[PDB]
Amino acid sequence: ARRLYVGNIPFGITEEAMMDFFNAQMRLGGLTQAPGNPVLAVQINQDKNFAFLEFRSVDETTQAMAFDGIIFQGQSLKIRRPHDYQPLPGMSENPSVYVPGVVSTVVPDSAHKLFIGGLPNYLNDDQVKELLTSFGPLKAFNLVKDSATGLSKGYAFCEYVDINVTDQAIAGLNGMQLGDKKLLVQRASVGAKNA
């Protein structure tokens, strides 16, 4: 739908670097119908050498297909439309397992809100939103500011729509370092891991 199938990718490169490469090309070529990042979710499977780039639209997505064969890190990124694939659901079980997080939320009540801490206060709202939105669709975004000063407190609460990208964003973002602060990303609730 809004995901492109890119193959012939360089084994070794990060999803972050490849995503920025595409974002840059979208901007420089004039493929962007809006500022920021056209890519909503970057999901790269380097094991089987295929990636699905989910864009914020379909227009830009279709426009990005023009770069089929683009030179990246020595490789030639093949850009085609993905195959007809349906995620096999469960009847009273899981076909196998997939990932603990899907089909687990049967009720609207769901502890899915992420707490993002370890951020500097010079980061403006737009940047923070853009960053987090580039790893999946956000349903809720509230940045904690100081009521008197006006600046950010350096942390926010944000909940993603999809249940897959949320933990994947944690795996990537949580562990980074913004200046002298280490980026801490987890869910606001957390029952009891003790790990």
Curated annotation (Swiss-Prot):
Disease / disorder: Developmental delay, dysmorphic facies, and brain anomalies: An autosomal dominant disorder characterized by global developmental delay with intellectual disability and speech delay, epilepsy, hypotonia, short stature, microcephaly, intermittent exotropia, and non-specific facial dysmorphism. Brain imaging shows a thin corpus callosum and/or delayed myelination.
Positions of post-translational 5-hydroxylysine modification: K129
Gene label: U2AF2
Residue span, RRM domain: 2-84, 112-190
The protein, known as: Splicing factor U2AF 65 kDa subunit
Family of the protein in this entry: Belongs to the splicing factor SR family.
Record function comment: Plays a role in pre-mRNA splicing and 3'-end processing. By recruiting PRPF19 and the PRP19C/Prp19 complex/NTC/Nineteen complex to the RNA polymerase II C-terminal domain (CTD), and thereby pre-mRNA, may couple transcription to splicing. Induces cardiac troponin-T (TNNT2) pre-mRNA exon inclusion in muscle. Regulates the TNNT2 exon 5 inclusion through competition with MBNL1. Binds preferentially to a single-stranded structure within the polypyrimidine tract of TNNT2 intron 4 during spliceosome assembly.
Protein localization: Nucleus
Lineage of origin: Eukaryota, Metazoa, Chordata, Craniata, Vertebrata
Quaternary structure and interacting proteins, as annotated: Interacts with U2AF1L4. Heterodimer with U2AF1. Binds unphosphorylated SF1. Interacts with SCAF11 and SNW1. Interacts with ZRSR2/U2AF1-RS2. Interacts with RBM17. Interacts with PRPF19; the interaction is direct. Interacts with POLR2A (via the C-terminal domain); recruits PRPF19 and the Prp19 complex to the pre-mRNA. Interacts with KHDC4 (Isoform 2). Interacts with ZRSR2. Interacts with the SF3B complex composed of SF3B1, SF3B2, SF3B3, SF3B4, SF3B5, SF3B6 and PHF5A.
Whole sequence portion shown: 148 to 342 of 475
Disulfide bonding pattern of the chain: none
Record PTM Phosphoserine, positions in chain: S147
